Amino acid sequence: MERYENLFAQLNDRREGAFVPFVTLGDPGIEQSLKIIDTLIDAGADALELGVPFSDPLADGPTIQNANLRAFAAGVTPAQCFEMLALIREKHPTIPIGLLMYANLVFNNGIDAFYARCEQVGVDSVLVADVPVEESAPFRQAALRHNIAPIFICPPNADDDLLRQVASYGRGYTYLLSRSGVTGAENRLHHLIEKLKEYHAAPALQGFGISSPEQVSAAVRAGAAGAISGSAIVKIIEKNLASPKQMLAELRSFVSAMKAASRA
């Protein structure tokens, strides 16, 4: 939790928004994933959103579906993901680390024990993609007990009861959903941003379909705290599977361009 509050305070002092990429842990392999993640940080990433591979990711479009299967093709397991997460934290003390989870992986060995393991390896937040605010009570309670920010989705079809709910219950950042549907860069909000600030919500990050520098600058201009980009990054991985070195160079140039767009 603490790392998001420190990041957003620094970004505002630097008159910058946050750029936050998403990747699947272990896509396309453990060793290459760790190099991917270090490149994203070194290229300008302000925080990370990291997926644990799951058998049935019903909130992901085809780009991240294939990322999960690539990770499964490498034999990646949740336990290997949490060893990666510890190593990532040991290398990067200030970078906020958020997890994108599916409910069964959090519930499998006990919800409280999941969040305790998150605290032990230094994760900062957890978004559970198939837990709506209506079902969130045991997840957010376990999260807070272990100093983990529970991340809530503010959809575009939200009403004022939902806005007050996400504002009260969330920490770290509010995930400002761009649109209906699933994750993807094939399918490309100021009103919600003001009410969220009115209700003292966690700072807002827009996600779902951010693929271009113009969209990052748009999120900052709308008064959001930053923008999240998952499929655009994963697509670069998917394009360059045969050339690991080119993959990192293409990742570096995209992240650098997206982070540059967050100054204004």
Partner: protein
């Protein structure tokens, strides 16, 4: 906030992305309103009688119980239009879609029976229907796929992951995630997020209501037990529902034991899985130690689903209903037995229920018992599967 309790004890819930919660709330409110609307009920009753053919017969099977003190009736959902009980509740959900002003239908199917049911209901009621089906299932169910397309439906194979039921389940929810303003998701069993377990039960409960009236007319008393196979739980809960408060009536659900529970190749999560959260619900699941959803297995495609409806998990937990399993070989022997001695070809799914009734009879042949088996479908779709096994076996 909901109008109805989303849980049966600790099982059930609404475990979907936030973006889909308004769709489930809309559907719950439309269902609650429709259940108070005599006009809706009359239209549903009209379709069930004059289009689907209800009431279905209750057949007394004399030959197969000869020499025992078991009396066995079969509730003949095999005679329903479409060939299985699936037709009942798609007619109700199709009317619910129209009540909401929706014009498109999304459906998932593994065996093809629910997809055929969804396609026929949509053809009749003028809804544009699209059906997701694991690519593996498309390949093995070419007849049902051709039936769906003859009825004007779009059949979409799902190459995601395992390319089976659960991935078809996933792509259906993925689609509905963006189209719910014009499309209704027509879930095929008594599972998934609230309100579907409740809706599917209420739109299948004529099975048990008719059975009760028919057995009282023929026998003057309630059955000692009613027996039904359990995939997701829709034909079983449809048979059970009207008997739940008749506490002398046993409620027996039969899960597929596949090659044997000990082999791990089965479809029996209620008794041999572990509670998890998937497909919008908290329910017993087939899952790895790490919490990945496992693949189930059964000779019958309609039972090959790695979870179970939450009302069944609840009825089990409080002891109101008992659940058992039946292997492939037991189901095959029940299939042959009904063909030869009653002239009825049962679905391999329903053959699991029949097999357990035959076990109850044969194990204790001087026990006086009045049993009803839910005969959830006909087995024309299964004769190629049975033929290949029988002659690969030698007989």
């Amino acid at each position: 906030t909901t109008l109805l309790n989303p849980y049966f004890g600790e099982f059930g819930g609404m475990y979907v992305p936030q973006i889909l919660m308004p769709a489930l709330n809309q559907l719950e409110e439309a269902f609650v309103s429709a259940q108070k609307d005599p006009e809706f009920q009359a239209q549903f009753a009209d379709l069930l009688k004059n289009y689907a053919g209800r009431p279905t017969a209750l057949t007394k099977c004399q030959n197969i119980t000869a020499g025992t003190r078991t009396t066995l009736y079969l509730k003949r959902e095999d005679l329903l239009h479409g060939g299985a009980h699936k037709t009942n509740q798609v007619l109700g959900q199709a009317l619910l879609a129209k009540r909401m002003g929706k014009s498109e239908i999304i459906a998932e199917t593994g065996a093809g029976q629910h997809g055929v049911a969804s396609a026929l209901a949509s053809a009749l009621l003028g809804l544009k229907c699209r059906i997701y089906m694991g690519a593996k299932d498309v390949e093995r169910q070419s007849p049902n796929v051709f039936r769906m397309r003859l009825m004007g439906a779009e059949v979409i194979p799902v190459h995601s992951g395992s390319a089976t039921l659960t991935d078809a389940c996933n792509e259906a929810l993925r689609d509905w995630s963006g189209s719910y303003e014009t499309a209704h998701y027509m879930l095929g069993t008594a599972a998934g997020p609230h309100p579907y377990p409740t809706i599917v039960r209420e739109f299948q409960r004529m099975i048990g209501e008719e059975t009760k009236a028919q057995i009282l007319d023929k026998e003057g008393r309630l059955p000692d037990a009613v027996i039904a196979c359990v995939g997701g739980g829709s034909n079983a809960i449809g048979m059970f529902a009207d008997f739940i408060n008749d506490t002398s009536v046993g409620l027996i659900g039969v899960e597929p034991g596949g090659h044997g529970i000990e082999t791990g190749e089965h479809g029996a999560p209620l008794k041999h899985g572990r509670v998890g959260i998937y497909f919008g619900m908290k329910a017993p699941m087939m899952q790895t130690a790490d919490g990945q959803i496992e693949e189930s297995y059964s000779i019958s495609a309609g039972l090959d689903f790695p979870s179970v409806g939450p009302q069944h998990a609840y009825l089990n937990s409080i002891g109101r209903a008992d659940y058992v399993s039946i292997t492939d070989d037991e189901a095959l022997e029940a299939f042959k037995t009904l063909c030869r001695h009653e002239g009825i070809i049962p679905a391999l799914e329903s053959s699991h229920a029949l097999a357990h009734a035959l076990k109850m009879m044969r194990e204790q042949p001087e026990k006086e018992q009045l049993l009803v088996v839910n005969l959830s479908g006909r087995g024309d779709k299964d004769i190629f599967t049975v033929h290949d096994i029988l002659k690969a076996r030698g007989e």
